[model samples]
Target: CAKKRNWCGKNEDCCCPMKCIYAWYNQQGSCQTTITGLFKKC
Candidate 1:
């Protein structure tokens, strides 16, 4: 399971899930705002 891909792989060998979360936060004020924007492709 952990060996699947970037999200599950260990170390910097794969992309970090936290980076995605951090990006979401950085892009929007909150999860709600981030998710809402996702719907319109905006």
Candidate 2:
């Protein structure tokens, strides 16, 4: 199933790998897209 909602944790942050990957690729749009896509699949 597709992750319709964005993943966010405490303090309005994305949980674990999602948050980490998002932050890590904040500047890299391509990378962020790829990583975020992976999150959707997971």
Candidate 3:
């Protein structure tokens, strides 16, 4: 699986399992925050 991509993958894409690997590129905080905003409170 590691051989299929680079350090952070091409175009800076992340392949970290069970975790968000691109938090540095996001301006709105962590992936958890970004994900929470996408779903409803229900």
Best by TM-score: 2
Candidate 3 lDDT score at position 32:
26
Residue 3 Cα positional deviation in candidate 1, in Å, after optimal superposition: 7.1
- Look at candidate 1 and tell me the lDDT of residue 14: 22
What lDDT would each prediction earn against the true structure?
0.26, 0.33, 0.29
5-42, model 2: which lDDT tens digit per residue? 54332212433234223445354211232444456543
Q: What digit string (tens of lDDT, one per residue) describes model 1 on residues 1-42?
A: 122223422222222222122334353221221223245342
| Estimated TM-score for each candidate | 0.15, 0.19, 0.15
| Number of residue pairs clashing in candidate 1, backbone atoms closer than 3 angstroms, sequence gap of 3 or more or interchain | 0
The best-first sequence of candidates by TM-score reads: 2, 3, 1
- Which of the two candidates, 2 or 3, achieves a greater lDDT against the reference? 2
- Cα lDDT for residue 31, candidate 2: 21
lDDT (tens digit, per residue) of candidate 3 on 1-42: 121223332322322231222446653222221333234232
- Candidate 1's C-alpha runs over 4 A off are 1-10, 18-42
Error at 35, model 3, angstroms:
12
lDDT of 3 at 34: 30
lDDT comparing candidate 3 with the true structure: 0.29
TM-score, prediction 3: 0.15
